[PDB]
Design an enzyme around this catalytic site. Structure first.
Site, short mmCIF file in Angstrom:
data_model
loop_
_atom_site.label_atom_id
_atom_site.label_comp_id
_atom_site.label_asym_id
_atom_site.label_seq_id
_atom_site.Cartn_x
_atom_site.Cartn_y
_atom_site.Cartn_z
N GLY A 1 -8.91 12.58 61.97
CA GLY A 1 -7.75 12.03 61.23
C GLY A 1 -7.43 12.57 59.83
O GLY A 1 -6.49 12.07 59.14
N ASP B 1 7.55 11.93 57.74
CA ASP B 1 7.86 13.35 57.50
C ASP B 1 8.81 13.89 58.52
O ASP B 1 9.80 14.54 58.14
CB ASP B 1 6.58 14.26 57.40
N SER C 1 -6.80 16.02 59.28
CA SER C 1 -5.99 17.23 59.52
C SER C 1 -6.88 18.43 59.59
O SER C 1 -6.65 19.34 58.86
CB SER C 1 -5.01 17.56 58.42
N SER C 2 -7.97 18.31 60.34
CA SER C 2 -8.86 19.47 60.49
C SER C 2 -8.01 20.63 61.03
O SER C 2 -8.16 21.81 60.63
CB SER C 2 -10.03 19.13 61.44
N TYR D 1 2.46 9.59 69.95
CA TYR D 1 3.07 10.22 68.75
C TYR D 1 4.46 10.84 69.10
O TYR D 1 5.48 10.58 68.39
CB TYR D 1 2.09 11.29 68.18
N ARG E 1 -6.67 16.66 54.38
CA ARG E 1 -5.72 15.80 53.60
C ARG E 1 -5.97 14.28 53.88
O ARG E 1 -6.37 13.88 55.01
CB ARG E 1 -4.28 16.12 54.03
N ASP F 1 1.06 17.79 56.90
CA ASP F 1 -0.36 18.17 56.82
C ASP F 1 -0.52 19.64 56.45
O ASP F 1 -1.34 19.98 55.67
CB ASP F 1 -1.07 17.94 58.18
N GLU G 1 3.93 7.02 55.75
CA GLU G 1 3.46 7.34 57.11
C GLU G 1 4.55 7.32 58.13
O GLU G 1 5.36 6.41 58.15
CB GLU G 1 2.35 6.38 57.55
N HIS G 2 4.54 8.31 59.03
CA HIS G 2 5.59 8.52 60.03
C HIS G 2 6.96 8.63 59.40
O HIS G 2 7.99 8.26 60.02
CB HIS G 2 5.56 7.44 61.11
O1 LIG Z 1 -9.89 17.49 70.36
C1 LIG Z 1 -8.70 17.83 69.72
C2 LIG Z 1 -7.70 16.61 69.71
C3 LIG Z 1 -7.30 16.00 68.36
C4 LIG Z 1 -7.22 16.99 67.15
C5 LIG Z 1 -8.48 17.89 67.07
C6 LIG Z 1 -8.84 18.62 68.36
C7 LIG Z 1 -9.95 19.65 68.27
C8 LIG Z 1 -10.15 20.60 69.45
C9 LIG Z 1 -11.41 21.46 69.43
C10 LIG Z 1 -12.58 20.79 68.72
C11 LIG Z 1 -12.44 19.26 68.60
C12 LIG Z 1 -11.14 18.73 68.03
N1 LIG Z 1 -10.11 20.16 66.87
C13 LIG Z 1 -8.92 20.10 65.93
N2 LIG Z 1 -9.18 20.49 64.67
C14 LIG Z 1 -10.08 21.51 64.36
N3 LIG Z 1 -10.92 22.16 65.21
C15 LIG Z 1 -11.64 23.06 64.42
C16 LIG Z 1 -12.63 24.01 64.70
C17 LIG Z 1 -13.15 24.74 63.63
C18 LIG Z 1 -12.69 24.59 62.31
C19 LIG Z 1 -11.68 23.67 62.05
C20 LIG Z 1 -11.17 22.93 63.10
O2 LIG Z 1 -10.23 21.98 63.16
N4 LIG Z 1 -8.35 18.73 65.89
O1 LIG Z 2 2.52 10.17 58.85
C1 LIG Z 2 2.06 10.32 60.22
C2 LIG Z 2 1.53 11.81 60.37
O2 LIG Z 2 0.83 11.94 61.67
C3 LIG Z 2 0.24 13.13 61.49
O3 LIG Z 2 -1.04 13.14 61.18
C4 LIG Z 2 1.08 14.37 61.85
O4 LIG Z 2 0.37 15.52 61.89
C5 LIG Z 2 1.94 14.42 60.51
O5 LIG Z 2 3.00 15.37 60.49
C6 LIG Z 2 2.56 12.95 60.21
O6 LIG Z 2 3.69 12.73 61.06
#
Ligand SMILES: O=C1CCCC2=C1C1(CCCCC1)N=C(Nc1nc3ccccc3o1)N2
Ligand SMILES: OC[C@H]1O[C@@H](O)[C@H](O)[C@@H](O)[C@H]1O
Ligand SMILES: Cc1c(C(=O)NCC2CCC2)cnn1C
Length: 392
Positions: free
Chosen positions: A138, A46, A140-141, A236, A37, A186, A43-44
């Site tokens: 950033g 929801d 929303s993986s 956050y 997304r 997200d 922002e901030h």
């Molecule tokens: O390090 C943290 C801190 C901040 C947010 C972030 C994580 C990690 C943790 C493990 C890998 C690196 C990032 N990953 C998620 N997202 C995510 N990991 C996936 C793996 C496969 C497919 C989709 C995915 O989405 N977000």
């Molecule tokens: O709008 C700021 C956003 O920060 C994010 O990415 C969190 O996952 C969301 O729920 C929202 O609060």
């Protein structure tokens, strides 16, 4: 330093299914996807029962897999930035023994959704996970991995609920298994996106409205700062607490119920910092209503002005920008044809979002990169569909 290629779902499907045929010795039975997304504005808000206006991206997570008969879950991810190991097996949780977060971290998102999945009986399953959403970048993986997992579990065992109930399971997985107390945005946009639309979400009522965003003269440019300060994680929840203190002090259920006028008259009831946080929030809710109105009537110049006001408010009042994002925004706004630019998501790193004339996009990219002291990454994305299923 042109825009980064976004693989079609078909390339992702072909890759995931091959990996699966190799990993498990048979063809997968099911494929699903959920997007990442970008939030256009709001922002901030929801978690303050505010208004948000995200759109789903052509970046997405894909799960391919098959149910098992032994009650075990067996996962493989190919995502490059994923933490070791790339595989993990665990039994389904039971009333006796629950799942627990740990290593590797990428699997905690899957485990969390399994733990809080509301329908039974859920069989175990084998699955391959692939993604084009930059991990932790950033966009929303993690929400896309949650919603993809949820969308997969529905095929193993249909739930009987609403879309917001699915978003809230995914949000609970993020809170409990990833330690990140996110609002609902997200997960909800990952579920509810539609091609060619942004989604106005009312986070108090949970009403949603699809706003057309599809005009060949217009583009959305996403710029990854490729920085993430540790504050993205620790500050956050601090912002959530500060908003809650202010709502309590004003005797309001949420800041959605508070207007600037009311806030300024209660200035002596909250900290100086709290006033700044809540002024952002109340203003951002109004800006998101105004931006939604502007988009509908095709007023991009006004939409862009509201984006810039959102960034300034985020930078100065909510204090969740950072020098990298600020430099990104100040550079974008100096490019002819750019309507507006602002940080998107939680802040303290990650991406900016820029609304611009489509023709202006390669100029914006050259200029933003040159005035950026770091290395920028770019996406040009249309509004995409949300979660999808394809039987294999
Ligand atoms: O390090 C943290 C801190 C901040 C947010 C972030 C994580 C990690 C943790 C493990 C890998 C690196 C990032 N990953 C998620 N997202 C995510 N990991 C996936 C793996 C496969 C497919 C989709 C995915 O989405 N977000
Ligand atoms: O709008 C700021 C956003 O920060 C994010 O990415 C969190 O996952 C969301 O729920 C929202 O609060
Ligand atoms: C509606 C849709 C699909 C689809 O039919 N199924 C999803 C799975 C195929 C691999 C992921 C893919 N992308 N989009 C946007």
């Amino acid at each position: 330093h042109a825009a980064l290629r976004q693989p079609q779902v078909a390339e992702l499907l072909a890759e995931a299914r091959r990996a699966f045929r190799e990993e498990f010795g048979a063809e997968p039975e099911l494929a699903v996807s959920a997007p990442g997304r970008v939030n256009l504005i709001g922002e901030h808000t929801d978690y303050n029962q505010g208004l948000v206006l995200p759109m789903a991206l052509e970046l997405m997570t894909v799960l391919v897999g098959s149910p098992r008969k032994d009650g075990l879950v067996s996962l493989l991810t190919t995502s490059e930035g994923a933490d070791e190991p790339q595989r993990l097996q665990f039994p389904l949780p039971t009333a006796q023994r629950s799942l627990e977060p740990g290593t590797p971290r990428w699997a905690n998102y899957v485990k969390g959704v399994i733990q809080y999945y509301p329908a039974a009986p859920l069989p175990g399953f084998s699955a391959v996970v692939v993604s084009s959403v930059p991990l932790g970048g950033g966009l929303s993986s993690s929400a896309s991995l949650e919603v993809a997992t949820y969308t997969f579990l529905q095929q193993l065992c249909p739930d009987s609920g609403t879309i917001a109930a699915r978003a809230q399971v995914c949000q609970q997985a993020e809170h409990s298994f990833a330690g990140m107390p996110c609002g609902i945005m997200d997960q909800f946009i990952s579920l509810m996106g539609q091609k060619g639309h942004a989604l106005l979400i009312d986070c108090r009522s949970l009403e949603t409205s699809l706003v057309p965003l599809s005009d060949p003269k217009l583009a959305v440019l996403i710029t990854n700062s490729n920085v993430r300060h540790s504050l993205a994680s620790s500050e956050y929840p601090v912002r959530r607490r500060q908003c809650e203190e202010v709502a309590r002090a004003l005797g309001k259920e949420s800041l959605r119920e508070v207007q600037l006028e009311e806030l300024e008259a209660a200035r002596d009831l909250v900290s100086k910092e709290g006033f700044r946080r809540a002024r952002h929030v109340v203003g951002e809710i109004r800006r998101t209503a105004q931006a939604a109105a502007a988009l509908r009537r095709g007023d991009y110049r006004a939409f862009g002005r509201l984006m810039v006001e959102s960034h300034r408010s985020l930078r100065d009042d909510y204090e969740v920008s950072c020098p990298e994002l600020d430099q990104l925004v100040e550079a974008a706004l100096a490019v002819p044809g750019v309507y507006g630019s602002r940080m998107t998501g939680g802040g303290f790193g990650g991406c900016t979002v820029t609304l611009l004339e489509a023709s202006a996009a390669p100029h914006a990219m050259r200029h933003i990169q040159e005035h950026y002291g770091g290395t920028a990454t770019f996406y040009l994305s249309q509004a995409a569909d949300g979660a999808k299923v394809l039987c294999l």
